[PDB]
């Protein structure tokens, strides 16, 4: 019941954490809009850094994956973003697409939660509106 | 085009290709690689735009070396024909530079773009 | 009583300025290891105010 290993993400403060399908890598969302991939396949108590996805100015409030290839993230600027996490791909970390949610006129819009739907290959997103 | 780095992404390029358009309208755009080199030497550039699809790509690869020397942010866009069209010409433009002017009417978004490029770098 | 309270804050104070210097007290290694680090507030207090916005009318 004690902290086995304390690891610093080495980025802005964390909003969200998610684990991949193979359970070997952790994706970590930050205040500074940086998404850090942490490798954990080494062993229990072994946390290692894999890669940093590009840096954007909106927070990352939520994270989920599609298998081990893509990272979907909801952002505080009212936009959903897909990053490419494939190993051996020139488009690694590459922000392939951006979606924009309908934004409250008088209010800031936040994408609080995003989840991936394998059967329909769809993304479901919940927003502040 | 592995060496073109950092390369602006599909969302980002609009904000880049947007700002260049008004800069051309307001005569704050120096266009063509050789003009960009002038602006760095005189240090009158907010930042510089390059096209990754250029062939042979190296022609602009001197500009970055001059860029970090002067601590000037820079970014690559995928298409050169797109850039020249945004510059406001009938010929593809590979490299373009925005002229420094704190009194400009388009002043705010240029630096907003500059910050994003800085984060990208 | 207020003097006693101010005494606590002096004990709580872990850094003081000496001339041009400010010296900082060093915490124990166990305090870090036993528990996770303290939450930063500006990151968290923001979420709480959002959940308790006026337009929501939590009332």
């Amino acid at each position: 019941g004690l902290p086995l290993r304390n690891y610093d993400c080495n980025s802005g403060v964390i909003w969200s954490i998610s684990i991949n399908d193979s359970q070997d890598k952790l994706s970590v969302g930050c205040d500074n809009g940086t998404v850090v991939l942490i490798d954990i396949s080494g062993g229990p108590g072994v946390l290692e850094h894999d890669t940093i996805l590009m840096r954007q100015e909106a927070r990352v409030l939520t994270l989920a994956w599609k298998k081990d290839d893509f990272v979907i993230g909801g952002c505080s600027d009212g936009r959903i973003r897909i990053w490419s996490a494939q190993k051996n791909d020139e488009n690694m970390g590459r922000l392939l697409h951006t979606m924009k949610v309908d934004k409250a006129k008088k209010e800031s819009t936040l994408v609080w939660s995003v989840i991936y739907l394998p059967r329909t290959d769809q993304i479901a997103s919940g927003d502040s509106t | 085009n592995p060496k073109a780095f950092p390369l602006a992404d599909a969302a980002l390029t609009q904000q880049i290709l947007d700002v260049v358009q008004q800069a051309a309208n307001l005569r704050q755009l120096k266009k063509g690689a050789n003009e960009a080199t002038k602006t760095l030497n005189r240090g009158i550039s907010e930042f510089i735009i390059m096209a990754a699809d250029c062939e042979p790509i190296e022609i602009l690869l001197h500009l970055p070396l001059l860029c970090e020397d002067k601590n000037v942010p820079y970014v690559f866009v995928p298409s050169r024909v797109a850039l020249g069209r945004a510059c406001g010409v009938s010929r593809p433009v590979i490299a373009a530079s925005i002229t420094t002017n704190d009194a400009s009417a388009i002043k705010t978004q240029i630096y907003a773009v500059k910050d994003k490029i800085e984060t990208l770098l | 009583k207020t003097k006693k309270r101010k005494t606590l804050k002096n004990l709580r104070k872990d850094s003081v300025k000496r001339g041009k210097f400010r010296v900082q007290l060093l915490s124990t290694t166990q305090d870090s290891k036993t528990l996770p680090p303290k939450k930063e507030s500006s990151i968290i207090r923001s979420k709480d105010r959002w959940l308790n916005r006026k337009a929501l009318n939590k009332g």
Binding site: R59 | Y111 | W50
Partner: peptide, 16 residues
């Protein structure tokens, strides 16, 4: 640079 921090700081803060 000093201003840009404010612009970045202002942009990140939620607007109510």
């Amino acid at each position: 640079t000093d201003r840009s921090k404010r612009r970045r700081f202002k942009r990140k803060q939620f607007k109510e």
